[PDB]
Ligand binder design. Structure first.
Ligand code: X8Z
Ligand code: NA
Ligand code: NA
Ligand code: ZN
Ligand code: ZN
Length: 259
């Protein structure tokens, strides 16, 4: 399950579909009036994501917005091509917009340098904390969840099966990780942001979480169980809470390391 690998797309719940690679989540949120894609995966992933969207019976021209969680290569590397293939506008937290436009991280990014750059992307605009993105019957809410990056966004919406509507959360990474030459200890406002974000995430309404790294909420296990139990298997409203706590533990572990 490498970040750029192939992966048979599947429905997670209702009009929420997985269209990413084997190691990184991307989600298509489909409607008759156009689709929203969350994240583009790697630069070569763009090949894969675009195949899937079509493998599920959808056109790329119907993709109107690409939402970014955050601007590291493994989630955002493919965004540029998908923009080109779809013609979509790319949406991102203000602080990551330049990194998507240019391909190159700011010095303030903990993985400046350690993550080599990626292809800069056309048609990028910022979203604000709380902003509601509408596309026909679709409504996706941005939540600022900075820390791992300054412009990190967690995205939420609702999908319905047989009249049962669930709150779906595409959770940004909340992990304190960086280049070797970077210390969270010397960046206490970065630390406060991470802490703010744990809180925000563990408070979201969260029936179904899809983590940017899909194993962070057991995607492939859930998918296995879903062959049996249907898409119930993806539903677990403790999931965002779980994610936040692993992030918060990971910040303890990391600040320790540093001393
Ligand atoms: C470094 C990445 C974010 S870009 C991350 O959070 N990963 C990478 C693999 C698992 C997961 C984690 O540490 O929880
Ligand atoms: Na973002
Ligand atoms: Na929806
Ligand atoms: Zn990252
Ligand atoms: Zn990542």
């Amino acid at each position: 399950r490498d970040w750029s690998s192939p992966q048979q797309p599947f429905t997670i719940y209702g009009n929420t579909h997985y269209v990413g690679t084997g190691g990184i989540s991307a989600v298509l949120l489909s409607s008759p009036q156009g689709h929203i894609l969350v994240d583009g995966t790697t630069e070569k992933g763009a090949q894969v994501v675009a195949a899937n969207i079509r493998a599920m019976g959808f056109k790329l021209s119907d993709v109107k917005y690409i939402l970014s969680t955050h601007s590291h290569e493994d989630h955002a590397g493919g965004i540029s091509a998908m923009q080109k293939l779809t013609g979509a506008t790319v949406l991102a937290g203000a602080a990551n917009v330049d990194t998507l436009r240019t391909g190159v991280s700011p010095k303030s990014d903990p993985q400046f340098g350690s993550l080599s750059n990626f292809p800069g992307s056309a048609k990028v605009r910022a979203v604000a904390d709380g902003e509601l993105v509408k596309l026909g019957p679709l409504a996706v809410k941005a939540h600022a969840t900075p820390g791992h990056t300054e412009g990190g966004i967690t995205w939420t919406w609702q999908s319905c099966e047989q009249g049962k509507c669930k709150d779906v959360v595409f959770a940004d990474s909340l992990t304190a990780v960086s280049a070797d030459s970077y210390r969270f200890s010397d960046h206490p406002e970065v630390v406060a942001s991470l802490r703010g974000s744990f809180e925000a995430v563990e408070k979201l309404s969260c029936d179904i979480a899809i983590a940017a790294h899909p194993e962070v909420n057991d995607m492939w296990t859930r998918q296995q169980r879903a062959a049996k139990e249907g898409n119930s298997a993806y539903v677990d409203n403790g999931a965002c809470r779980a994610i936040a706590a692993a992030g918060r533990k990971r910040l303890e572990t990391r600040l320790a390391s540093e001393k």
